[PDB]
């Protein structure tokens, strides 16, 4: 419920074009990153990440995608599950009639 609330909030935040909102939204996704890591809710993590990846492909979000590709917002990193110790190799391999009246005025 509140997860969908902040989902709608980051959609409207990336839709508007204020430059501090880009860092505010990357703060929101870095908040939900640690939240969906440490709450054991990996299905929401990877499904939401695939949906927002589809959204940032169909929209531009160009300078926000620039701070993403200098920050890193990618899929589940480790083993497509909740437990492993794998670094950002997955992140870096996925992101390398009427005519008379006219003259009668």
């Amino acid at each position: 419920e509140a997860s969908n609330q902040l989902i709608n909030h980051i959609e409207q935040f990336l839709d508007t074009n204020e430059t501090p909102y880009f860092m505010k939204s990357i703060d929101c996704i870095r908040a939900f990153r640690e939240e969906a890591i440490k709450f054991s809710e990996e299905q929401r993590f990877n499904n939401f990440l695939k949906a927002l990846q589809e959204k940032v492909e169909i929209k531009q979000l160009n300078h926000f995608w620039e701070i993403v590709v200098q920050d890193g917002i990618t899929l589940i990193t480790k083993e497509e599950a909740s437990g492993s110790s794998v670094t950002a190799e997955e992140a870096k391999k996925f992101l390398a009639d009427v005519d008379d009246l006219l003259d009668m005025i």
């Binding site: 909030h9 409207q12 839709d15 508007t16 074009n17 204020e18 501090p20 909102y21 505010k24 009639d97 009427v98 009246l101 006219l102 003259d103 005025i105």
Partner: protein, 510 residues
């Protein structure tokens, strides 16, 4: 202003919270007491008090109700030049993006956030009412227009009305060019946001009181509108399509408002309006931009949609804004014998060229409640017995075409026994027909109801369709009474004439 370094335990961090308000009070009294001298080119200890003024409203330590008694002395600063103005706008925007509600009044009222919200915003408008700065207006017309009705839309309208008439013409034009430039740029965002600027702000600025002859914003719009209007429509994606419509209808609304309250001389005489749209001194009489806009205006609503279903609700607003523009321009031009019929009613439907079927809904049902005065009924009883023996917007009267229609109808009454040409007989052909759909007949019904004083002498023609509509059963509801009450009210109050017996179908309808 020479011993400001002696008090630095006051306006610092880990200080008691009230001494900062003491500093604010001192700055208020000192700034008010001498002159406007501590505002420019480092006169006195200027960069040592400007840092106090910055850090007192940039800090994340004071409360929201306390930074209002800092923001109240904004007129002392917003007349300076560039430089630190970016720092001022940066700390203002850093305040707004971190200590306001998120989109539009997302809070239950009475709570301890709506209180401080209105506390801050009323002081912003307190400053903006006298310090007519073309900087502060843009700080709030982007928090406003993320929605439709903030909580306090009437506060904003009253303050923009207070701003618009001040004198010093050379800054109102700056306000106008600033809002038109923040509306005109690319900066891609929603159509509601892109429309509400020139639906609320610029409209009340040009509307309320600017000048009778403020032709400057006239001059910087002439070859700015028609290049946008005289374009094509590229139907690949909706996201370019809607803003194409939005800029077009915004230019329509702009030209409507500036044509309406401007006399005939400085639009249509041999002046620097036709000499503005064309190159210098030419030999044209008055009609260079007029026919150019009128041909695309007539092309706008007379436009069939026999195979288009992509975004048509917006094209409804486009077509009615076009018809509004047509009303206003044929108002403010020559006003000859009869042009209104041929330019606003001469639909030739053999190639699917009609008017009303595009610009009214034909999907939304109109509810028409029961009632929930008596002296009106008593008075009409006495006078009808003797002879024999503003407007209320409920649902139908706020449909963005009624008021100019009644305005031009009153103009045709007080501007110039068979019938009247097409603006009455065309409607009688489209009201006294049980083949026209319902909502057009309700449209013209309430049009005649609001214009009952001018279709009075032709009631011998206007008897059957009103009565037929009130008696015939397609009106929905319980056979709706809020319309048939007013229909029989006008149809029995214009007695004496109209002879309600004498035709057999009239008799069986009665």
């Amino acid at each position: 202003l020479q011993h400001w370094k002696k008090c630095d335990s006051w306006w610092a961090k880990d200080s008691p919270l009230e001494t900062k308000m003491a500093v604010l009070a001192l700055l208020a009294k000192i700034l008010q007491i001498d002159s406007s001298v501590s505002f420019n080119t480092s006169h006195g200890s200027f960069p040592e008090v400007f840092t106090t003024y910055i850090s007192l409203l940039a800090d994340t330590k004071l409360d929201l109700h306390l930074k209002g008694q800092a923001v109240t002395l904004l007129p002392f600063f917003t007349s300076l030049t560039g430089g630190s103005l970016e720092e001022l706008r940066r700390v203002l925007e850093q305040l707004i993006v971190a200590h306001f509600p998120m989109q539009s009044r997302e809070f239950p009222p009475g709570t301890p956030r709506f209180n401080n919200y209105v506390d801050c915003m009323k002081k912003f408008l307190d400053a903006l009412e006298l310090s007519q700065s073309p900087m502060l207006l843009e700080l709030m017309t982007e928090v406003l227009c993320r929605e439709q009705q903030h909580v306090m839309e009437e506060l904003f309208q009253s303050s923009f009305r207070r701003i618009a008439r001040r004198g010093s013409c050379v800054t109102q034009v700056g306000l106008l060019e600033s809002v038109y430039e923040m509306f005109r740029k690319d900066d891609p965002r929603l159509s509601f946001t892109r429309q509400s600027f020139v639906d609320r702000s610029l409209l009340t600025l040009l509307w309320h009181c600017s000048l009778d002859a403020l032709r400057e914003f006239f001059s910087t719009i002439v070859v700015d509108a028609i290049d946008v209007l005289k374009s094509r429509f590229t139907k690949l994606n909706e996201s370019t399509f809607d803003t194409q419509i939005t800029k077009k209808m915004g230019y329509y609304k702009i030209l409507d408002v500036m044509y309406s309250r401007l006399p005939k001389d400085d639009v249509h005489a041999k002046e620097s309006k036709i000499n503005q749209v064309f190159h210098g001194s030419c030999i044209t009489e008055g009609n260079e931009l007029t026919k150019t806009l009128i041909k695309l205006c007539y092309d706008a609503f007379t436009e069939n949609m026999a195979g288009e279903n992509q975004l048509l609700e917006r094209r409804r607003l486009y077509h009615c804004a076009a018809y509004n523009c047509a009303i206003s321009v044929i108002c403010c031009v020559f006003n000859e014998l009869k042009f209104y019929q041929g330019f606003l009613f001469s639909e030739k439907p053999e190639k699917n060229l009609l008017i009303f079927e595009n610009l009214i809904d034909l999907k939304r049902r109109y509810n028409f409640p029961v009632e929930v005065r008596k002296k009106k009924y008593i008075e009409i009883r006495k006078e009808a017995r003797e002879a024999a023996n503003e407007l209320e917007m409920d649902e139908l009267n706020r449909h963005e075409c009624m008021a100019p229609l009644t305005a031009l109808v009153k103009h045709m009454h007080r501007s110039l026994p068979r019938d009247l040409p097409s603006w009455m007989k065309f409607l009688h052909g489209k009201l006294g027909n049980p083949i026209v759909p319902l909502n057009i007949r309700l449209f013209l019904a309430k049009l005649v109801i609001n214009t009952e004083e001018v279709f009075r002498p032709y009631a011998k023609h206007w008897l059957s369709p009103l009565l037929q509509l009130a008696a015939s059963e397609n009106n929905g509801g319980e056979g709706i009474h809020y319309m048939v009450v007013e229909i029989v009210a006008t149809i029995l109050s214009w007695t004496g004439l109209a002879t309600p017996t004498g035709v057999p179908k009239d008799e069986v309808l009665a």
